[PDB]
Amino acid sequence: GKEAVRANIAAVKAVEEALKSTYGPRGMDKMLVDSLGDITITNDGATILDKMDLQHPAAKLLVQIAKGQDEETADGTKTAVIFSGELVKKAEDLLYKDVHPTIIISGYKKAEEVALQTIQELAQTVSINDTDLLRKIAMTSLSSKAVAGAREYIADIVVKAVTQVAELRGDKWYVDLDNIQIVKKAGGSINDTQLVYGIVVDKEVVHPGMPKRLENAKIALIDASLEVEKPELDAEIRINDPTQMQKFLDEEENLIKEKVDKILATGANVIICQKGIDEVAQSYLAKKGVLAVRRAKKSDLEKLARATGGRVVSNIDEISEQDLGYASLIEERKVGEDKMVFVEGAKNPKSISILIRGGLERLVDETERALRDALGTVADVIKDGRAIAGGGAVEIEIAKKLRKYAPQVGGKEQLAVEAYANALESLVSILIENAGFDPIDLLMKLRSTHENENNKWYGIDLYAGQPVDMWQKGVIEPALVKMNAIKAATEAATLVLRIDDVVSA
Amino acid sequence: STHENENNKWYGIDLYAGQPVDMWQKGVIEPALVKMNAIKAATEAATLVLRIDDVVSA
Amino acid sequence: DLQHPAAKLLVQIAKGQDEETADGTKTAVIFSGELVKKAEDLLYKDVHPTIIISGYKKAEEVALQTIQELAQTVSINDT
Ligand SMILES: Nc1ncnc2c1ncn2[C@@H]1O[C@H](COP(=O)(O)OP(=O)(O)OP(=O)(O)O)[C@@H](O)[C@H]1O
Ligand SMILES: Nc1ncnc2c1ncn2[C@@H]1O[C@H](COP(=O)(O)OP(=O)(O)OP(=O)(O)O)[C@@H](O)[C@H]1O
Numbered sequence: 312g313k314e315a316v317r318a319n320i321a322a323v324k325a326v327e328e329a330l331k332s333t334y335g336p337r338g339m340d341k342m343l344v345d346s347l348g349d350i351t352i353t354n355d356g357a358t359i360l361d362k363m364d365l366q367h368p369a370a371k372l373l374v375q376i377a378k379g380q381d382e383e384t385a386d387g388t389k390t391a392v393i394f395s396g397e398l399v400k401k402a403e404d405l406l407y408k409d410v411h412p413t414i415i416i417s418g419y420k421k422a423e424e425v426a427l428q429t430i431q432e433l434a435q436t437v438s439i440n441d442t443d444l445l446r447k448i449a450m451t452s453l454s455s456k457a458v459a460g461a462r463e464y465i466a467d468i469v470v471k472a473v474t475q476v477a478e479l480r481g482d483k484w485y486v487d488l489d490n491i492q493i494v495k496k497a498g499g500s501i502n503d504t505q506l507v508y509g510i511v512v513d514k515e516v517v518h519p520g521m522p523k524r525l526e527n528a529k530i531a532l533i534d535a536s537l538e539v540e541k542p543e544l545d546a547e548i549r550i551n552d553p554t555q556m557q558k559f560l561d562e563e564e565n566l567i568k569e570k571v572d573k574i575l576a577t578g579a580n581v582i583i584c585q586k587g588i589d590e591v592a593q594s595y596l597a598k599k600g601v602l603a604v605r606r607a608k609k610s611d612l613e614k615l616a617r618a619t620g621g622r623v624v625s626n627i628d629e630i631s632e633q634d635l636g637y638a639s640l641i642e643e644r645k646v647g648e649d650k651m652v653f654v655e656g657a658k659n660p661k662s663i664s665i666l667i668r669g670g671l672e673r674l675v676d677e678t679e680r681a682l683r684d685a686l687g688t689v690a691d692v693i694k695d696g697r698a699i700a701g702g703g704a705v706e707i708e709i710a711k712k713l714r715k716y717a718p719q720v721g722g723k724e725q726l727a728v729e730a731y732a733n734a735l736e737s738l739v740s741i742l743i744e745n746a747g748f749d750p751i752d753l754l755m756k757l758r759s760t761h762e763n764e765n766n767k768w769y770g771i772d773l774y775a776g777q778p779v780d781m782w783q784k785g786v787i788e789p790a791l792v793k794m795n796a797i798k799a800a801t802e803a804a805t806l807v808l809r810i811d812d813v814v815s816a
Numbered sequence: 817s818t819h820e821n822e823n824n825k826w827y828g829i830d831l832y833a834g835q836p837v838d839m840w841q842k843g844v845i846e847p848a849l850v851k852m853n854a855i856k857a858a859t860e861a862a863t864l865v866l867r868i869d870d871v872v873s874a
Numbered sequence: 875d876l877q878h879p880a881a882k883l884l885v886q887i888a889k890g891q892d893e894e895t896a897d898g899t900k901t902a903v904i905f906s907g908e909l910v911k912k913a914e915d916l917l918y919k920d921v922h923p924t925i926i927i928s929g930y931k932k933a934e935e936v937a938l939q940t941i942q943e944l945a946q947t948v949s950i951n952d953t
């Protein structure tokens with residue numbers, strides 16, 4: 312009976328009330344204070360559920376199906392929880408009316424069916440030629456981010472960045488996002504961001520008298536040191552005579568000139584490593600006419616290997632012409648007071664990098680977050696091909712469409728369907744609420760102007776406050792993220808109904 | 817009232833005389849950037865407090 | 875010594891300055907809390923914070939430009 316079922320529903324209603332004010336734009340941020348007293352203002356759905364201790368089994372089970380994703384995007388997480396907890400909310404009112412859950416499941420399952428298929432016979436075909444569209448869909452992701460510093464600048468980048476990487480695979484475009492590096496240098500201006508055609512290494516060339524820009528680079532990616540190593544690294548030496556000393560530390564220093572001659576044996580003109588270059592070896596490279604980089608991050612040597620077609624060499628006695636990385640031109644370039652190596656004209660044409668400049672020290676990170684996400688949304692639309700209008704449009708229709716279905720479904724199962732439709736309008740009602748307008752007024756002004764096909768892309772513009780076309784204001788979203796979120800969400804909702812008892816050991 | 821005309825823009829308040837006067841023409845002049853970064857500082861904080869809905873703690 | 879999150883957050887935005895000499899630091903705190911104070915009086919009339927933020931923002935604008943289109947040019951030879 313009532314026994315355990317309340318506790319589950321209650322636990323869920325609780326989580327809903329924790330995120331409610333933060334759904335869509337105009338959302339009212341939450342403050343999170345750590346155990347050592349450190350403060351975080353945010354609206355990240357995920358963290359707020361993860362970072363919490365939920366006593367109840369029920370909540371964690373619901374957030375487990377809601378939060379997650381098995382694809383390379385992280386969008387739909389606030390809608391997934393909320394629509395789910397509203398569906399749980401709306402189901403209680405049927406248990407009050409004395410409708411068994413076996414009926415509510417069959418009703419909602421049948422409603423969900425039609426509700427799913429109404430995104431299929433409505434989604435719009437978006438391909439690679441619609442680059443004037445990805446610009447919009449992109450901005451639609453960045454616009455509710457914290458930073459308002461030149462987002463058009465960044466929105467344009469995300470398009471160029473995904474369309475460059477786009478490869479025709481199995482007669483359909485695919486995008487392997489890993490072909491994009493992100494480097495950030497705080498300050499200057501956000502307007503100074505640009506896209507680099509090639510991998511970018513954040514360290515300098517070890518002597519400025521080497522070539523500024525070197526022609527037809529035969530790079531040598533060297534993992535092993537090019538500096539002497541210690542005979543006293545763990546503990547002190549056992550030599551007693553300095554003549555014996557000498558001949559040790561002498562032959563080990565001729566071992567680096569040996570390594571340098573083994574690398575130039577290959578015809579290398581530039582050389583990058585992740586360990587040192589001895590000062591007698593900088594001097595050795597200066598006299599030969601070679602361009603050397605000392606202690607660069609191996610994390611970007613890896614990324615520079617499969618971009619220039621070279622190999623990250625762990626033994627200087629194994630380097631071959633085969634292993635030298637090729638690039639049309641390598642140079643060192645200055646950014647304020649810092650200098651990085653850039654390697655344009657690399658053999659892999661898909662491998663590119665983004666250089667962020669501007670903002671404050673923590674804001675620049677969030678600009679990187681936003682860009683990760685923005686590349687995501689655009690890539691995932693491309694990978695799919697389908698995209699619907701945001702702003703509650705496709706939602707309001709699945710409600711209207713469900714309500715027309717309701718009569719025909721049967722007795723009690725009509726009320727299930729009619730509830731499902733009501734839970735879906737409640738979503739847009741929360742969104743309207745959080746804008747500071749009346750949910751009923753606007754819900755009705757819209758759901759009457761949505762009966763004819765002429766108004767398919769009508770939603771509610773969260774700053775105007777009256778029904779308009781969101782498609783023609785750039786507010787579009789991935790048709791499949793908002794499709795797997797609903798499937799996920801209903802699964803969870805009805806799982807909360809499935810529980811007759813909880814037995815704890 | 818004595819600042820209604822545009823000619824009396826540099827009017828402020830005499831802190832010893834105690835009467836509205838033109839401070840430019842009395843030697844009390846100040847860096848124009850300080851009373852500008854103050855305003856940006858203050859509104860950021862202001863608008864940010866209003867942005868907090870509720871508090872969670874460890 | 876403040877443990878209230880909001881106060882610690884406030885003092886951080888107000889006190890700190892990214893330039894060598896620091897002035898306006900008393901002004902910064904009073905005007906901030908006053909902007910917060912005078913906003914309370916609108917909340918009391920049931921007005922929602924998203925309006926008050928956008929209201930103030932549009933005002934911050936006018937307020938900023940009103941210092942620019944008015945300052946007098948001082949140089950190395952105005953000793
Ligand atoms: N300017 C706008 N006017 C109207 N609706 C908007 C606007 N911008 C976005 N929306 C709608 O707001 C809805 C909810 O936004 P949000 O993206 O915050 O929910 P979410 O996708 O579940 O959260 P997250 O993106 O963090 O996972 C979106 O699905 C979108 O259609
Ligand atoms: N005799 C005076 N007549 C008019 N105003 C005066 C006079 N002396 C001081 N002032 C005004 O006093 C104001 C406030 O000074 P104060 O420096 O204490 O504020 P603050 O700059 O916020 O504090 P701090 O400099 O420590 O950060 C100045 O902006 C200045 O114009």
Ligand SMILES: [Mg+2]
Nearest residue numbers: 385386387388
């Ligand atoms: Mg989203």
Ligand SMILES: [Mg+2]
Nearest residue numbers: 896897898899
């Ligand atoms: Mg002062």
